[PDB]
């Protein structure tokens, strides 16, 4: 009888992606971890603090659009 409808798209920002491609904390340390002998041979990224934090930061859907 009265309806409210909100569509919402969550995306990753450009800034987050730019940061993940650079060398600052924690993405630099992650890149260093990827050359260490315990990690380097695998298909998976290092199970390190640096790569994990980097993963969380990057996958946060900070860009919200309403329609």
């Amino acid at each position: 009888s009265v309806t409210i409808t909100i569509n919402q798209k969550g995306e990753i920002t450009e800034e987050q992606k730019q940061r993940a491609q650079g060398d600052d904390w924690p993405y630099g340390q992650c890149k260093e971890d990827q050359k260490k002998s315990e990690w380097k041979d695998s298909d998976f990224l290092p199970n390190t603090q640096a790569c994990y934090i980097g993963s969380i930061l990057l996958t946060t859907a900070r860009k919200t659009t309403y329609s």
Binding site: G10, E38, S42, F44, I56, T59
Partner: protein, 168 residues
Amino acid sequence: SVDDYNPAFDNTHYSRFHLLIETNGITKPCIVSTENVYTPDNATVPHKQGSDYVLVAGLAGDPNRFSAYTRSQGGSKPLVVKLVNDGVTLELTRDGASINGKAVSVEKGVQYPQDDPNYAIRVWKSGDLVMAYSRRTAVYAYYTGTAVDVEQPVTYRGRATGLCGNLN
């Protein structure tokens, strides 16, 4: 720029439940590679493993209730893992998985006991990812072939054994 998890924002890879229980110290993840144990007390302890199974976690004087062991084999995906939950042994390798000895179709779902909602172990595989959880112990783990994450509940504080060490 921002360095903390914000649960106000949806995350494409992670749950609120996981990251909230983790950042509030309810779970205590331990990462073991072929070369190093990364303790939940924030310490890197070197261990270059044999093919002797080495105690990484377990209850102090009840290893049947909960214990976790790690082996190195050789070649690519060299890490082998033994997880004991309420006297039910899960063995993980690059090739798949077994419960007590008997190999199981881990690429579908597998639960033991299959009928019991208070299950000793559930285990699932997709590509080289293996996940495992026990409702009896509340120990979660996951496995890549290169490393394993063994996550203990904080309720084990004061009863923690193995290379993963103190819960603080």
